[PDB]
């Protein structure tokens, strides 16, 4: 269960990280 | 079955995916880098001169900024794999950790302020060597990826 | 720690590096560890999930270990070193020897199977003397 | 049906805070409207 | 927008209202072992009111269930009247008709309120049932499961809840926007 | 050799307890989350906030966040109080059930299966054992004859093989 | 809770008793029984003293109520309601 | 805090283990109890 939460958690944050800059991009 | 040397394993590839994000990013940035050496570097503009220099200053500040992570993640990936006694896997990784060693702490760069340095960049050869290291470590960093998921497997099953 | 650390430096809360260094981070995860508190929460849900995940393995750990103990404190088992032979052939640490001038010294001299082979082996290169004169001996 | 109690006494609590923060809701909103 | 926030509510109270109705009508909670099955006894699937055998001479007959120590009396009681998962879907109905008001009423938005109050009421009814059917259950014959009524009611908890978040949501941006509105005025 | 399943961490505790337990986080955290924020009365509770609170209460850790409200905080304490009950009953079945898993002690004596009843033994019908057993002046074996001949319905055997064969499909329960 | 309240109503550290009111007190009582936290701790040695007091009656009862649930569970002891006549 | 987990579970722990081992004891209630035993020892008179 820790190893799927850390790799889910990197995956949550690769998400956050591509819409955050699309959204920084449009502004 | 479980074992240390497999928990070993899956927190490694759980690591290593940050490695190639990391390399991706590095070889993104050089390619960027690249479109603005190889194109034209007339500075006749005040304004474009200032525009470079800051995007070239900022990108070798992320470079800086996001090196030691790689280097000590792989230092980990080591002492790791030492700890659980997994031979091979250590032997294999000895190698990089020493080149990246060597490369942190010589500074062939005259300045020898930092690794990467705004005035030292954009010099053809650096770039060039920049990109190929940055490439061959992607493609080790996938070939370690795979072979840590398919040594993870061998230990569960047996 | 490590995690939390990536996934706090290179996808923030938007400042939220300064907080969740590595330095930070291993705090938490040690104080998460010990059930005591925070100096900081993580806010994003990638750091909040890392959390999560380590709240729960802290949890189980500790009440294994308090229960675990429990039984050991509550039920003595005392488990004899050996349990046959060949257990006493491959230990060194042990000593083992018979009487001298016996039947039974005289059993493991003139043996064929391994093992006693082996003991024989032992008791003829031991020092000091594993043999002995008398029963009560 | 061990441990049904606790779970009674968390709904019953639940319960109770709605009822309490409808209760300060309706008794704020009547003074501040006088 | 609010125009979709409130579209998601009103689709969520209709589901949920009419799966827990499902579940309720429905006898397919528990796949257990009963002594009543003419042949420790025969394959039963079960529901709140009544009981039907599976696999057995009286395949496909299904018979009202024999229910029935002040607590066991009255977990007995409340177990058969099954009050708690109805009023669940009652005031999923009623939540739902106090957000079609809301459709009307515009100006009034102490009634997105109400809705939210009853889906959160609701979501704890069914709760409460789940716990009552399952403390019911055991008794003091193995092997036993739940069916896909058991997993409905609960995917009308959750989305009872879910929707009562919404519609606080809502409810919320609209006395912001009044308010607002009315002190820049 | 029972090798311990994945997810035997949970053994302690049924299904239906963590099942509830998930409800009554999601019920608890909403509910929070309602009486934080309903009144136009700022809160740092949201939905997402209220999750979080509730998911490190259950796990005795706390987060920066407290409720002020006295609706608030009867939700939290009533939380807490599940929470105090919910682990340390976890905590001390599992320590009941390491504990009894070191208790066990398994045959290794006649006297041990003499006393114990819950495994049957018997031997071939016809042959020494039967005749040894019978014309026993000992006490251990004149109770294991007294327990000899009961109704298992049938402790006793006619083929030695059969009585390999019986030993194992019985689970167990044959010696 | 009410000690802790006097106390840092007319001892407090100087304001001091917006913080530990009553209701601020009883909430820094039960988050102590219930091993959580504190958003507030005493800062008065009067107040540090009732909550470290408080902190060992908690950390005792809790542990004892673990144990003598352990012990319930793994001892199973059934009482027959008589053993006589009367 | 590494000391105060390993001192708090093994009062904890310990503290179960005297109450189990309290709700264990079956004390003598027949011949057969003092029989098996031989903490407490058991004698008639010489003559009778
Ligand atoms: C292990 C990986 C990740 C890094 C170290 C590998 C070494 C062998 C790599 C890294 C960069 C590489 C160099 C990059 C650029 C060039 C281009 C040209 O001049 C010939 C080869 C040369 C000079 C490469 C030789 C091999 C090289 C030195």
């Not at chain 6, 136009?40 to 002020?68: K, T």
Request: with cysteine.
């Amino acid at each position: 269960i820790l190893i799927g939460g850390l790799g889910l958690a990197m995956l949550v944050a690769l998400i956050e990280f591509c819409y955050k800059s699309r959204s920084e991009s449009k502004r | 079955a479980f074992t240390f040397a497999a928990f070993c394993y899956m927190l490694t590839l759980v690591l290593c995916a940050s490695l190639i994000f990391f390399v991706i990013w590095h070889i993104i940035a050089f390619d960027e880098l690249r479109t603005d050496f190889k194109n034209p570097i007339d500075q006749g503009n005040p304004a474009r001169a200032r525009e470079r220099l800051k995007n070239i200053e900022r990108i070798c500040c992320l470079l800086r900024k996001l090196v030691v992570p790689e280097y000590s993640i792989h230092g980990l990936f080591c002492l790791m794999f030492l700890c659980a006694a997994e031979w091979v896997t250590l032997g294999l990784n000895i190698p990089l950790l020493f080149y990246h060693l060597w490369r942190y702490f010589h500074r062939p760069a005259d300045g020898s302020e930092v690794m990467y340095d705004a005035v030292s960049i954009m010099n053809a050869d650096i770039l060039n060597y920049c990109q190929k290291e940055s490439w061959c470590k992607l493609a080790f960093y996938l070939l370690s990826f795979f072979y840590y998921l398919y040594s993870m497997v061998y230990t569960l099953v047996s | 720690s490590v995690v939390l650390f990536l996934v706090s430096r290179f996808s923030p809360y938007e400042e939220s590096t300064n907080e969740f260094g590595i330095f930070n981070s291993l705090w938490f995860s040690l104080g998460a560890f010990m059930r005591q508190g925070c100096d900081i929460s993580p806010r994003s849900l990638s750091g909040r999930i890392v959390g999560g995940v380590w709240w729960f393995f802290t949890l189980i750990i500790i009440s294994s270990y308090t229960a675990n103990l429990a039984a050991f404190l509550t039920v003595e088992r005392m488990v004899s070193p050996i349990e046959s032979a060949e257990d006493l052939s491959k230990q060194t640490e042990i000593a083992y020897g018979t009487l001298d001038s016996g039947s039974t010294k005289e059993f493991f001299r003139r043996s064929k199977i391994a093992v006693f082979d082996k003991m024989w082996t032992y008791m003829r290169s031991a020092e000091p003397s594993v043999f002995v004169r008398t029963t009560a001996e | 049906s061990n441990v049904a109690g606790v779970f009674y006494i968390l709904v019953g609590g639940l319960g109770l805070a709605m009822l309490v923060a409808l209760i300060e809701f309706c008794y704020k909103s009547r003074a501040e409207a006088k | 927008e609010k125009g979709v926030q409130v579209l998601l509510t009103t689709i969520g109270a209709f589901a949920a209202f009419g799966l827990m109705t499902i579940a309720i009508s429905t006898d397919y909670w528990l796949y257990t072992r009963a002594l009543i099955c003419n042949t420790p006894g025969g394959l039963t699937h079960s529901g709140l009111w009544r009981i039907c055998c599976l696999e057995g001479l009286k395949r496909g007959v299904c018979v009202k269930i024999n229910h029935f120590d002040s607590a066991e009396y009255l977990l007995r009681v409340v177990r058969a009247s099954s009050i708690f998962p109805i009023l669940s879907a009652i005031l999923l109905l009623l939540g739902g008709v106090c957000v079609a008001a809301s459709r009307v009423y515009k100006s009034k938005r102490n009634i997105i309120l109400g809705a939210g109050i009853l889906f959160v009421a609701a979501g704890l009814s069914n709760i409460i049932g789940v716990i009552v059917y399952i403390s019911a259950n055991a008794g003091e014959k193995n092997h036993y499961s739940y069916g896909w009524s058991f997993y409905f009611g609960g995917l009308s908890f959750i989305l009872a809840e879910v929707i009562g978040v919404l519609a606080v949501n809502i409810y919320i941006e609209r006395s912001r926007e009044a308010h607002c509105q009315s002190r820049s005025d | 050799k029972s090798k311990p399943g994945v997810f035997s961490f949970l053994d302690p505790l049924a299904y239906e307890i963590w099942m509830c337990i998930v409800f009554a986080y999601i019920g608890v955290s909403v509910v929070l989350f309602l009486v934080s924020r309903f009144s136009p009365y700022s809160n740092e509770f949201g939905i997402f906030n209220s999750l979080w609170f509730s998911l490190g209460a259950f796990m005795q850790q706390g987060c920066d966040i407290s409720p002020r409200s006295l609706s608030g905080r009867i939700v939290g304490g009533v939380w807490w109080f599940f929470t105090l009950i919910i682990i340390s009953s976890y905590t001390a079945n599992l320590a009941a059930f390491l504990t009894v898993e070191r208790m066990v002690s398994p045959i290794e004596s006649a006297e041990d299966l003499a006393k114990q009843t819950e495994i049957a033994y018997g031997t071939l019908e016809a042959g020494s054992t039967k005749e040894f057993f019978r014309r026993s002046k000992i006490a251990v074996f004149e109770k294991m004859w007294t327990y000899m001949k009961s109704a298992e319905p049938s402790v006793f055997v006619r083929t030695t093989e059969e009585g390999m064969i019986r030993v194992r499909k019985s689970k167990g329960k044959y010696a």
